[PDB]
Amino acid sequence: TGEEYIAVGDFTAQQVGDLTFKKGEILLVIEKKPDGWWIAKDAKGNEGLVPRTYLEPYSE
Numbered sequence: 820t821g822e823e824y825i826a827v828g829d830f831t832a833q834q835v836g837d838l839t840f841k842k843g844e845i846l847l848v849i850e851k852k853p854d855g856w857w858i859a860k861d862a863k864g865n866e867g868l869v870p871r872t873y874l875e876p877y878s879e
Contacts, residue, residue, distance in 0.1 A: 821849035821860060828873030838867025845877060 826840040838861055840846055847860035852871050859869040 821847040823847050823877050823879065824871075824874035825877050826869065826873055827875050830869065830873070832867060836868040838865060838869060840869065846874065848874065 823845055825843060825845045827843055829840070829842040830837070831839040837856075838846075838859065840861060845862060846869055847866075848857040848869070848871075849860065849866065850856075850858040855870050855872065856868040857871055857874075858866055859874075860866040
């Protein structure tokens with residue numbers, strides 16, 4: 820149900836859809852960059868809109 824990257828940027832959600840992650844945490848990704856965003860998940864349970872741009876793959 821997605822692949823996991825970690826964010827390496829500190830983004831917050833300003834609109835609905837997006838999530839709030841920090842510069843070096845682990846996220847999951849679910850959908851591919853239509854316009855820049857994928858639908859990701861965090862280590863809380865929720866899922867948002869995070870870009871790929873500041874996402875790096877992880878070593879599970």
